[PDB]
Structure 1
Amino acid sequence: SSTQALTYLNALQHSIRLSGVEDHVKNFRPQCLVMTGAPNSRPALLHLVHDFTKNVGLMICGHVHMGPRRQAMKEMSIDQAKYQRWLIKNKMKAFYAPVHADDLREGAQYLMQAAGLGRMKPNTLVLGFKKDWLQADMRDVDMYINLFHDAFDIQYGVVVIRLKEGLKNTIDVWWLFDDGGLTLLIPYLLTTKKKWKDCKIRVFIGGKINRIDHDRRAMATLLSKFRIDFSDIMVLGDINTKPKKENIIAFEEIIEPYRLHEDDKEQDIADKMKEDEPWRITDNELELYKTKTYRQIRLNELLKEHSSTANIIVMSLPVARKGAVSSALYMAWLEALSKDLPPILLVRGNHQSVL
């Protein structure tokens, strides 16, 4: 009170010192940019992202305020004061970062390219899964997926937390493809927080039916390199199998409102809808990506079968080339992958290795 200048000067001096360093490859140091609507909303997501980003990296709770430009400054100021007070009340090492933008994409770009000083710049983007995508306008879903792809453009690592907001054995990990160390680094950082200390990492991977021993040995060596006391590596070959009849029926029902039946409908009408409504899922997309959808459905049913009784499932996030797949189908894949499981955490880190 009246002598905060000392704190400010100390912070500035330490930040300059930190910027003094020159080597970044050695330490990945996960810095998270959490894109939640407001810190008060989605408290569970905030706690879970804070768990693995606390004393091991900062977290910037971003907020893209959008509205009339005239009174934007006063609204943003009152919001910053209120949300910072709330966010310190529920002790969190998180910085509230509000910006003004005409839409979520622009504000996300502001936060993703400008937030932070020197070395304290976010390098992963954390999004809560858009649970209301079915009832939401599909333009906003397109914007959500385009935000994923913008993150992948700036060499960010995308984390998607799907968590049941209506609210002690193991922490399953479903490492499938390389990414980096991030997918395996999130469980390591989770385990050392004294809240998940009594939780045991039960890694999973896919492999050939004639190579369980060799794959297990190699993955155990990698885990020892990551030194996360892996309990066991349940190498599976069940991937790439027709899931079931009921599961495929459920997925078809999910995507039915957005499917485009070009063959059933007249070609001119199909083109008209595509031009005036480009997020419609064409049948060509389904035919091309039928194996990928089978992979998603099979992975979901495997998660239910093996990892039902797990606290935090960590899985690798499916991705597709920008524009190669309709946004509606992409969110359908994300819905199917994480359907009725415990708090699940889809991760795709950047190519550069964490350590």
Structure 2
Amino acid sequence: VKFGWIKGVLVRCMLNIWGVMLFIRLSWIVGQAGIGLSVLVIMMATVVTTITGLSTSAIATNGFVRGGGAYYLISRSLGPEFGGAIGLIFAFANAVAVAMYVVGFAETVVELLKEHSILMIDEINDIRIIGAITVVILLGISVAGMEWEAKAQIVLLVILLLAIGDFVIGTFIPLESKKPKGFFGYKSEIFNENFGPDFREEETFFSVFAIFFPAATGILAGANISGDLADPQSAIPKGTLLAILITTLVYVGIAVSVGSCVVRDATGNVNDTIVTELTNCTSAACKLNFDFSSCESSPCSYGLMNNFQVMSMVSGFTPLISAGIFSATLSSALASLVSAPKIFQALCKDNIYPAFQMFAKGYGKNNEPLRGYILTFLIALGFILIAELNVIAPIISNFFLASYALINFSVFHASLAKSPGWRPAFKYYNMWISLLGAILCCIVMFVINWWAALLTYVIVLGLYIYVTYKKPDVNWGSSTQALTYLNALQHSIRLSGVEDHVKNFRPQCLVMTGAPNSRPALLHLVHDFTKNVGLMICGHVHMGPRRQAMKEMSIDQAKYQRWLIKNKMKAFYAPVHADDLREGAQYLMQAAGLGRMKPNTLVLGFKKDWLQADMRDVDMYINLFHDAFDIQYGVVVIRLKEGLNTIDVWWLFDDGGLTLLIPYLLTTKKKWKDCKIRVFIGGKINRIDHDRRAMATLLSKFRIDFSDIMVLGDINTKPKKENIIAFEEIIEPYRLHEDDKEQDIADKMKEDEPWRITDNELELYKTKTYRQIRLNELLKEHSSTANIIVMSLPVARKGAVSSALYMAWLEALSKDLPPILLVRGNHQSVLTF
């Protein structure tokens, strides 16, 4: 195993390219299109094949390649879905190409048998029998061992080269008996008259090019043996390119030699010699002592345009050329039958399609895919028993063009996504040359057949879609991921370019939910806005040992982010390590995001069970509120029923407009099309008409489309004493009965626990406590039925009120209601203009 670059790559691919076209139809295409146009066709195929060779060389030299060849190269340089689609397409294409080569062999054998006396059953049936027998022999030689395959390849290569040498030496020497058939030894007049094209039949330049192109195919057999190769980096590039050079030179030289020696038209009748009657005919045959005037209006069985096997006749010892044709065709068939199962093996090993897994088995020491050999045997056998392959030839040609085109596109994509890790170490390549190769392959496959190209395109698209939806886990970093990163970075830079405006103010939320999966209810509620309308950073502070915490954080970021992706959530999980909530919250609030994608609101889940929890946590909560207010953030406190007349807005306190913007953003969603926002405001009595008119005008200026505005004048009134005593007994644990108890002891138990609610605080904020209690009462009795409630949260200066008192206010305001969403903004958010 581990073949060298001469044997593994150069011999294998050089043999694969040389096939049926070289010794049979090359002369025919030279006849159909003149020497110049035939060489132009050969050079078109050469440029497409050369760009493909350069691209596959660029991909192959970028690090080790495990195996599977073209599939591995493309699937690692490009995404796994393109890799899988191309792997399946190319595997099937090579499997069919095995049948195509074998049926070419079989029809050559049938022709050699027809010119002899014997014939077995019939041309087509004998083709079927010969093809079946030969595919069985090919399967046997392939499963006998890859070393035996290599020996067969090299012996067939020397046979083919001897055949070409026989042809050229025969071309040097003319023979008197070959004159009637059309052979003259390098006559300049023949070259002159054959330089022009003459397409007597329906064939056109595009038709001849499409017929010739299959000759150029098969260059990836060098790369398709990547698994069993000593050093693909140094083997694939030089071997492939030199093989392309050698085969194209041979093709052009042979075509020019045949076109310059054999006449376009001629009949085998020896009685056509023109002797001493030099007449007024300017045809290139007249001046060469043989007048083939009959072929103008009579069918002749010889000449370039009529005879396919003129290459055999022109060369001395024509049985040797027949053996050469057999060697070329069988070698190409064996190369295809070896290339297809290996690429299929790699494709199934990567398990892009879980349906196909049995064919990845590694029977033998070299991991030979014997089941792949059987599958390719069956495909080739079927396509041979069909026995009529010319109908599907454009299909396979378009499969090959698709594979080459996506190799070129993989090079262009990997080079476009400027990233470390794309270091091919093949200097001779370019982004634009590869892109040109890709577009050239697409136009060529369209030229060959306009509907086969569409069929191939739709098949590739279908496989792409199927793999995308059936996304498997893939470790190999493709150029798609690099391009995603580069696009994200470029778009972020461009966003940093544009200045901010109050019209396009996006709510950018920093949700302090610890474990996102813990409380998905308010997570979805915060997702109702900040979905295609703003970003959503689900922060999370980690506590514990410093150095080791990163490991935990890493796995956490791996888990929760995945969870966010698993649900239809558009949010980023941004973890930090901090000693306490305030430190990590400050980390995030200070340096979260980048560019202009910075959070501007701190969405906080309401701290349920604040009574049971340690009071240090509650004071931490209130200090977090204050920190958010100090850094110019908009706090949003959300209270839900986590275990499990539509939307109400309470524009009690004026701010930039966040308390009104959020309800509107909630309305424009599929869950709540029927929004029907009911707006409320605290207006003095005997002014409700004026306040309602003014608020309706303002809400028309900001197009929010309320349902009906209501004005309340009872918001600041003494509430029912039952609720007052409920609030008092709720606070009772956190009271500071300084007046009742002795001054010294009260000071002692106040300084050690500064969160205690001084009676002075209660006497100063009795009005505010009544306000919150009354707001809760009137809201509960009025809007008991509603799907969302929004209100402006109360705010007190840091240290002015105890954390216990502030949390008591928050809890009393939203004691037991439908989902409530208290809001507070900083700067202007909604603009009439």
Which TM-score tier does this pair reach, normalised by the shorter chain? over 0.9
Question: Per-residue displacement from partner, 1:53-101 (whole Å, max 9, x unpaired)?
Answer: 1000010000011111121111100000000011111111100000010
Q: Counterpart of 1:221 in 2: which secondary structure?
A: helix
Q: Counterpart of 1:158 in 2: which secondary structure?
A: strand
1:205, CA displacement in angstroms? 0.6
1:37, CA displacement in angstroms? 1.3
1:274, CA displacement in angstroms? 1.1
Distance 2:479 2:562 in 1: 18
1:23, CA displacement in angstroms? 3.1
Distance 1:335 1:166 in 2: 18
Distance 1:49 1:298 in 2: 28
Distance 1:307 1:179 in 2: 23
From 705, 712, 723, give the equivalent of 1:247.
Answer: 723
Question: Per-residue displacement from partner, 1:224-255 (whole Å, max 9, x unpaired)?
Answer: 12211111111010011111111001001110
From 486, 489, 505, give the equivalent of 1:12.
Answer: 489
**Structure 2 portions without partners, runs of 5+:** 1-477
Distance 2:782 2:539 in 1: 35
Distance 1:256 1:205 in 2: 32
Q: How many residues matched?
A: 354
- Contact 2:560–2:573 at 8 Å: present in 1 too? yes
Question: Per-residue displacement from partner, 1:188-213 (whole Å, max 9, x unpaired)?
Answer: 00000111111210011110111111
Question: Per-residue displacement from partner, 1:23-77 (whole Å, max 9, x unpaired)?
Answer: 3333221100000111111100100001011000010000011111121111100
Distance 2:681 2:671 in 1: 26
1:140, CA displacement in angstroms? 0.9
Please show how residues 76-91 of structure 1 align to structure 2 within 5 Å: 76-91=553-568
Distance 1:304 1:246 in 2: 15
Identity, % of aligned positions: 100
Distance 2:632 2:799 in 1: 18
Q: Counterpart of 2:677 in 1: which secondary structure?
A: strand
Distance 2:488 2:480 in 1: 14
Greater helix proportion: 2
1:2, CA displacement in angstroms? 6.1
Q: TM (normalized to structure 2)? A: 0.42
Distance 2:828 2:679 in 1: 22
Please show how residues 197-346 of structure 1 align to structure 2 within 5 Å: 197-346=673-822
From the CA coordinates, give the structure whose radius of gyration is larger. Answer: 2
- Contact 2:658–2:824 at 8 Å: present in 1 too? yes
Distance 2:500 2:579 in 1: 37
Distance 2:500 2:538 in 1: 27
**Structure 1 portions without partners, runs of 5+:** none
Find out whether 1:186 has 2:665 as its counterpart.
Answer: no
Question: Per-residue displacement from partner, 1:258-310 (whole Å, max 9, x unpaired)?
Answer: 00101110000011011111111111111110000000000000111111101
- Contact 2:521–2:640 at 8 Å: present in 1 too? yes
Q: Counterpart of 2:718 in 1: which secondary structure?
A: coil
From 523, 527, 530, give the equivalent of 1:46.
Answer: 523
Find out whether 1:112 has 2:112 as its counterpart.
Answer: no
**Worse overlay, 344-353 or 60-69:** 344-353
Higher relative contact order structure (alpha carbons within 8 Å, sequence separation ≥ 6): 1
1:222, CA displacement in angstroms? 1.2
Distance 2:624 2:702 in 1: 30
Q: Counterpart of 1:195 in 2: which secondary structure?
A: helix
Q: Counterpart of 2:490 in 1: which secondary structure?
A: helix
Q: Counterpart of 1:12 in 2: which secondary structure?
A: helix
Distance 1:26 1:206 in 2: 27
Distance 2:782 2:493 in 1: 49
1:172, CA displacement in angstroms? 0.4
Q: Counterpart of 2:679 in 1: which secondary structure?
A: strand
Q: Counterpart of 2:610 in 1: which secondary structure?
A: coil
Q: Counterpart of 1:233 in 2: which secondary structure?
A: strand
Greater strand proportion: 1
Q: CA RMSD in A?
A: 1.0
Distance 2:667 2:552 in 1: 39
1:179, CA displacement in angstroms? 1.2
1:221, CA displacement in angstroms? 1.1
Distance 2:688 2:722 in 1: 30
From 638, 641, 645, give the equivalent of 1:161.
Answer: 638
Q: Counterpart of 1:229 in 2: which secondary structure?
A: coil
Q: TM (normalized to structure 1)? A: 0.98
Distance 1:293 1:333 in 2: 7
Distance 2:647 2:622 in 1: 28
- Contact 2:661–2:829 at 8 Å: present in 1 too? no
